[PDB]
Amino acid sequence: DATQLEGAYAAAWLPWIMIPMITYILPFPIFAIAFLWIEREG
């Protein structure tokens, strides 16, 4: 029946790439950008 993740909805390939980007690809760049922002010197 459900051997893997599926989408019975329109553009069901979008979770497949959106969950990696939002959750483990773009976050460490965002953390690096915020760390460089809070540690930059006057």
Add this chain to the structure above:
Amino acid sequence: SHSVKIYDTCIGCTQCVRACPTDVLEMVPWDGCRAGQIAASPRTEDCVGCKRCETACPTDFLSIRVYLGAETSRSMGLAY
């Protein structure tokens, strides 16, 4: 740095100066009380904020107040 303020209810008992672990306080001549002395806080860049000076004060209310302010590496008591 913290702000240590001394008010005119001071009686020059020196107990705040003796209780300071970091030597912020000293006694200066006043002629505003009969001891002839009043506390002063010039080296307030050294103040850690322990408020031992306030615990040592006998006047009600206190003649010395410490206002914890901007934290530096000296007021945080950091040996690292």
Add this chain to the structure above:
Amino acid sequence: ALTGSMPKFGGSTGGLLTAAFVEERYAITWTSSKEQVFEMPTGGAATMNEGENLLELARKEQCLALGAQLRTKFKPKITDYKIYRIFPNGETTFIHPADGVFPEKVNEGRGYSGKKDRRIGENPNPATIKFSGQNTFETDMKS
């Protein structure tokens, strides 16, 4: 530039770290009449030499804790200690005693540096110094 033998001590993990050499170090010098054991403010027991001793510590509070130990835990008292602040360029600054007496006594010439002629319960109440920058004790009036 500072005179004195380092006290006889085996070393500890409680001593100087990076911040000693990149921010500031303190030194305390004192003269003892005999070679005798004191407690390091960093933990442990060291031996002060007969004569002039010089010890580098990380904080001014450690130098003042040692000095309070010297003048209270020893008979005769050691009251001639001097505390200096050492900067990373090597610059040494004599800080304690700031005058040359001892803050607990009263010297003619020190000068007021925290005095506020008030009575605490009459600071300006905060509604009036809102968008000013001053806060309630760094002011000049009395309400």
Add this chain to the structure above:
Amino acid sequence: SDAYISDDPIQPYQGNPQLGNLATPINSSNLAKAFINNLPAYRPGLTPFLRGLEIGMAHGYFLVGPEVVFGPLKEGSHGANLSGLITAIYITVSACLGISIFALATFQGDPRGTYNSHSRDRLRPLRKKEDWYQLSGGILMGSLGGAIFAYALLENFELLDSILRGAVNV
């Protein structure tokens, strides 16, 4: 009386008893120093890129294994080696992004702490930001290469096994 008057195995660090360390056999013996001081982080004379390259090779190599044996793909050989390879790749890229942003944040004017010009830390010898960027590039290159070398040895384990048993001499 006895405080540094007898000569013991544990000495003050660098002969200075007011330093916050002790000279014990683990940080001061000839075997411990000969091992540590010749590790790529501390080997004398090396450029930061070569230090980082050797650190990365050694690191990306072993980082493949934990997910090959323990990962979610462990029931099958090919997927297990791929999951270990991409885990090593991700850990390498995250660690090197951290090295780069450490160098970016630390070396701003005269740095604070051990990378200040007045610092006496013997255990942190990369004093310049150029050293840190060369190290980051080397660790990235070496670690990604060592990870794919471990991956290639695990993918061809059937061949490497038949070789090391002499099964190729028929």
Add this chain to the structure above:
Amino acid sequence: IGPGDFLVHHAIALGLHVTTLILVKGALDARGSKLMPDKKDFGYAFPCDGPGRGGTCDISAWDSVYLATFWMLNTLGWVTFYWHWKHLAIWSGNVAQFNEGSTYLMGWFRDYLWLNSAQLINGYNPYGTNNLAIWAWIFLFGHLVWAISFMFLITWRGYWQELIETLMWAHENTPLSFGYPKDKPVALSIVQARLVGLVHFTVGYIATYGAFLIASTGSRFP
């Protein structure tokens, strides 16, 4: 409504009154009290005024909102426990469960918390997983966060500052550890850890009850 309603309404009255006591006391003593006459010169949030005068822990007005958040959470717990059990007994048809079981406290403990937990905590068991698995996981997650709160709430700052000093010793003396803190590690401040522990207590308290209320109702009445 019957006898079991009168008692829980008096408990709700107690809860609103004590929460109002804490908040009114801290608002009216915000500008100063007898223990600290010039409290308005120190701000809204400040740790204490030291250990003098017997000790002045939690003396600021911010600490009253701190101390009344626990009582608000407890009062709303009583309110929502009452509502949920009243309605579970009504929806099941067995209204006598709440009627002759909410007048004593073991009935609240056993016929509400213990009884309507059997489906939630069996969301995953050693035999399989149903759709209540996330509610069981969030139930345990809220218990974890609530327990972590007590670390910030019971242990205070100097313990952790001395622990962090030993950690700073360990880091500067380890080989191959080339990182160094740009900003010096210090323990969380007194007011900061009060806020952190309160946020943890709140988040775990909301997560535990949200997981229990969705799973004790969504399982009995799918």
Add this chain to the structure above:
Amino acid sequence: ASAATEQSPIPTSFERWAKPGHFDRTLARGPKTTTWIWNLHADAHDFDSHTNDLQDISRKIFSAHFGHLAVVFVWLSGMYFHGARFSNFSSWMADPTHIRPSAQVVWPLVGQDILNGDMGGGFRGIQITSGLFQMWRGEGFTNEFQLYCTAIGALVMAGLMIFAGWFHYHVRSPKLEWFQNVQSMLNHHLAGLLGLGSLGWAGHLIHVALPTNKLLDAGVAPQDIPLPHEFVLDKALMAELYPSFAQGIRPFFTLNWATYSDFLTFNGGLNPVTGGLWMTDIAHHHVAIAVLFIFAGHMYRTNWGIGHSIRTMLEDARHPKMLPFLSFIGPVGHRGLFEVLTTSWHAQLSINLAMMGSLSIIVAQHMYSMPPYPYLATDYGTVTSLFTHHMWIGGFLIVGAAAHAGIFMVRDYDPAENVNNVLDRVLRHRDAIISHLVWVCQFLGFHSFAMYCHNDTMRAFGRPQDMFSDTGIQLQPIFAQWVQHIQTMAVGSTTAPGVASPASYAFGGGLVAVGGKVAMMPISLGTADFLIHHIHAFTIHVTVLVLLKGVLFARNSRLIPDKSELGFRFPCDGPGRGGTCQVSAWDHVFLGLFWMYNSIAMVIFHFFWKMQSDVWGAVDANGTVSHITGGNFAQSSITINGWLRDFLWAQATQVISSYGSALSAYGLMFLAGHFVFAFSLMFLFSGRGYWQELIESIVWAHNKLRITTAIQPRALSITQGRAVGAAHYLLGSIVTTWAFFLARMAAIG
């Protein structure tokens, strides 16, 4: 007079009773506020603060010890009297498998006699779980008159102990040179207290207990048994039981000891009849350890040249006289430690509390697996209660050890005395000790608890092949499994040919079942046992971290360099340096009390669930064992959810469904413990200034009614609020577990 060491003053006065605070100079000032009332009981026994002479303090301590012994004898007298008047001891003596031990009856007051449950035999009482009946059966008691005699003897001993404490302080108190005779004290305690004590008990066992137990196991009714003195009196009766008593005490002096091998056996298992250890094997144990302890008591030089001097042995343990890898302790070694331990009472108390708590824990772990009394292992409530009680006593004692190691530091430690020795060198690298303890606590916390969280997530995902189970990623404790295999191979007909059975059946061997129920059987160690032992290691290590940190930084730290000047029990040093809250050593004892709770609670939970699912049960006629919870420890105790569902939610069926039954007091105390736990959090989360400012409004309302009181009402101090919160948390949280354990074990056996 006999040793010329007494002549004590302090005349027995009565007037000195209506002046509380007479011991402290500030306590005898004049109350003024309410803090004085609480200060009266905060340092009432602290004789170190009161005076300054070590000899007066030692005299006070000696007489306080005597008064404590008197209190313990009063308690023993009460227990024997309860077993002799309000018990079913005779009924249990008749049938100790179908009768429930009971030694407490409740008066018929309001709803109250429902707690009197039917204990078998028509006896309406409360089922005791103290193991008194099983102990009295093993000692040799058969009727209640002997228990009454023992109660009277203990009461007489209590009166004698309160006379010895008054005579050794108010009449003829010892000198300080007598207290400092540690050589003589060790010699006498090792040879006369332990050695002669166990020798006398071996004599009792050989002549009273072994006879009575042998007849009891044979089948003789308890009042058909001869009284113990006939066993002592005529040797024909005693030689019927043992054929080695026909040769009297002759084979012992002529060194023919295998003649005695029928009452000094070396079997090493469990009696199949009773379930307890072999009584002959017990007697042989006591004979051997009497010979060992008496021989150990001749070690220390006292007045005759031969012996050791502990000062010489301490001063020689130093580099270069040590093992080469142990030579890091330097050329002073243990030089100043004999003067530390003979002048500080706190140093001695710290060592003795650590050893006493550790030994109480050892007692707990050795009496479930080698049940030493008849019909002990089958009464599961008693086994549970004894293990749990001795674990709690051990944990509390171990926390007090750290408490007094910190009191020694602030008060009794002298830097000039002990220079560059082991004590100085530990304080001189304590950052290394504490940071490595921090790292090992973190490593153990991830590799025990976060693996449980891994298991929860994998079980909720529906992927149990990814779990740390015995069916997923196996984590077998191969070293403990190997030790278990070595223990069961040793006892073969090998490395211990003398023993027949294994030292416990917990290691391996067979199954002992008594009265249908399992006395003991092998405790299999799988992945769940690996995980829970690492939970134990983690919790013990964080307790050690919390306690050792306060001991090592009791003098000073990098934050507060003069912490010894602030005291041992002080709240803080102000909101400066970031805020130095709970920097004292006392606050570390405070925070380690919580960690000892969290450590011992998981130990007693591990014991309860593992013994209840993999040992205890009901053997049928064939031999099949149906365990109580059904062997669900191996698959449910590997997730946190299975611990909350299959242990806490499932096994609390008997304590919450107890209303209206005879176990209803347990349900009441379960709820009471929850109340006291929650009430503690008022003191733990809140601070002192709130309560002092609320008391201001209450004092205003009182002043308006002119109901003002002289003693000025003040909030509890900071450390007192901490102590009150800790005491309440511990009390409620332990009463809860007590009610849960005891209601569960009194309902399903």
